Curated annotation (Swiss-Prot), chains A, B, C, D:
Classification via HAMAP family: Fe_S_insert_IscA
Cofactor: how and how many bound: Binds 2 iron ions per dimer. The dimer may bind additional iron ions.
GO molecular function, a single term: ferrous iron binding
Induction: Repressed by IscR.
Protein name in UniProt: Iron-binding protein IscA
Pfam families: Fe-S_biosyn
The keyword Membrane appears for this protein: no
Taxonomic placement: Bacteria, Pseudomonadati, Pseudomonadota, Gammaproteobacteria, Enterobacterales
Subunit description: Homodimer; may form tetramers and higher multimers.
Residues reported in the UniProt entry to bind Fe cation: 34
The organism of origin for this protein: Escherichia coli (strain K12)
Length: 97, 97, 97, 97
């Protein structure tokens, strides 16, 4: 399952409300350097013929089809306070080794 | 499955001779901060029962079963020359840029 | 020197109250694999004699003297809203892209 | 000092010979994500009005002026064999914390 934490959902709902117009979020993964992978997290106004759309806690999360299996299991979290305020990704099968 | 290019296979077949010790390569993933992930590439002596072992051009590639969702269809590759000399990963689950 | 924007200062002045414990922020650098570096941003209770302490809008910023070459002229910044919500660093020594 | 290790110099000299034409390397540092910095390492055919040119072990290393202080102290190394073959950067004031 791709999911949002409660805080991530409440934050995201308040940006989508306050921005008025929209479909939802893209979740994505891209290359970063020669040995890294980086989560991609942005607003999208429509799904592409290449996406699958998931929905959790009322937000639509658009995910490219060729990355669906990779991204399965990720949870988007939001840390509301402190020096690491912001969005965060986790996945129980990717260990902090 | 997992594969290796002719150049990566040739380099790793060499490293294997020169250390005459192990079973093959492990290919893994780990966390890299809260917004990404890094490849793990190492020599392993023995597989575990949690692993799925592929063999391509004489190199056994060992992958923990729970990491397959991140890695599957990946080609391990190698650039002989230039400033990016080294191993690199060509991963269909991951988008370029 | 080191500075903070009005938004980052306001957020950090809050975090400071709410924990009523420390002296200010430490800004540092560390290694991030063999091809890069990461910012360190934390609360410190006491400076050391190795540090250079700046103060901007009521927040003491503590920097190890040997890290100044990486950090100097840096502004600590903060984005209240959107998917990049969080602290960010605006560092004149470092090029954008 | 900005320096090249012996191996990095011999490797680099053999690419600049074999490529025939050139001035030297750029060393650079760029942003990477919201909390990362990435070394930039490429060939350049000329210095820009913005660069300072350094020379060590016979190779010209071109460095943007606004990044000179940041980059002071870095050594470019080259690992000739093993799974981490390739170029590498170090700096005694950036600890592997």
């Amino acid at each position: 399952s791709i999911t949002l934490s409660d805080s991530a959902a409440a934050r995201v709902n308040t940006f989508l409300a306050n921005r008025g117009k929209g479909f939802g979020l893209r979740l994505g993964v891209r290359t970063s350097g020669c040995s890294g992978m980086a989560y991609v997290l942005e607003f999208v106004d429509e799904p592409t013929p290449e996406d699958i759309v998931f929905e959790d806690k009322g937000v639509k999360v658009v995910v490219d089809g060729k990355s669906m299996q990779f991204l399965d299991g990720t949870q988007l979290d939001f840390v509301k306070e402190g020096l690491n305020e912001g969005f965060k990704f986790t996945n129980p099968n990717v260990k902090d080794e």
